[PDB]
Design a protein around this ligand. Sequence first.
Ligand SMILES: C[N+](C)(C)[C@@H](Cc1cnc[nH]1)C(=O)O
Ligand SMILES: [Fe+3]
Length: 403
Amino acid sequence: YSVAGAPEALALRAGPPASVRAALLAARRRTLDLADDFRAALGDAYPGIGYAPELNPPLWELGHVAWFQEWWIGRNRQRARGVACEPDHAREPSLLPQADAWYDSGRVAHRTRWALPLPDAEATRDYLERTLAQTLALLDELPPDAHDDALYFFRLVALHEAMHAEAAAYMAEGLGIALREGGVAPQLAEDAELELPAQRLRMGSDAGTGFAFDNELLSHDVSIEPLRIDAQAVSWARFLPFVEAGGYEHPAWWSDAGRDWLARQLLRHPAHLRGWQQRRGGRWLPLDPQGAAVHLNAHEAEAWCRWAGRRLPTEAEWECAALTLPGFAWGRVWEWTSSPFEPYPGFAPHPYRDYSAPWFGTRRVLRGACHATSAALAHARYRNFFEPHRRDIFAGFRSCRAP
Ligand SMILES: C[N+](C)(C)[C@@H](Cc1cnc[nH]1)C(=O)O
Ligand SMILES: [Fe+3]
């Protein structure tokens, strides 16, 4: 197998304290850069945005990132235990007396987040700074040969912050907020197909390759059947002939859930489009056909596939291809699979017990990464998981077929 991600992703998961230190600093620089993009648009108004289930107020997100880091690092009396940490052991206070009522995503009700007496933006950024200084002081006590258990929570909180930075980016796109950061379409999209031979895949994350998310365990052998798979995610050039052929008016290409979704849509075409313009950073721009198709849900991906005589890969097929085919290029958009988000054999929840387990059975797996995913997070073993209707996320897909 090839490496699963860029050097930063391997270093965060397996590297020494100095690697995780650099990752925490890089994560915070990205968080604050995105916070400054939201500040330019919203002027530090709280809540600053209207209510929707797919949003959180930007200043709430910032406080949550700080709270999570402080909960699992400075206040955690069992850091050295790693995955054996008792999640509900007695903690000493937060810097903020109300932080546990305001920022714990498992405690604070969703709509409530718009109506809390939160600190102002400057005081929120001070909370971030003070908790990061605490975190880094504790990290600097660890020796170069620190065990995985010793580094576990430092790695976890770096990755958590990376996930919320990507959420800031897809929320921004929904809210028409322009960011300084952004991905670049290729001059020419690749349409090629690759052969994936029959093979055994050792799926998931092995005991000692460093940090694993709980949903990557246990590692387990699976059989891969021969297939031909797209070398890259489906481009808008490849997607749009489905729309031109009437695919959003032909219920027969759609599943039952896809038909129920399709019947409740005001606009019979992809999200964010009105050839076509695309709304990006609150500006209507001409659509680039070479870009990866994006903001498509699983129902839209599946219908395209039926129209094309192709299918989605399973997450195992995707992982196998990513690790074994040098021509398999990913990382532009998250890619819907056909696989429901379900535990691997031998799954056990890790100390952040609510990360995976509540979401089994209602989410679909996406693989890969998008342009707004941290280089430290993007990884071929990583399982993303969203409800199959979601279009706000930077999701697209690739297709495959029999040999
Ligand atoms: C793994 N995803 C991206 C589906 C998670 C990430 C997450 C952040 N804080 C807890 N979990 C999500 O959006 O809830
Ligand atoms: Fe979170």
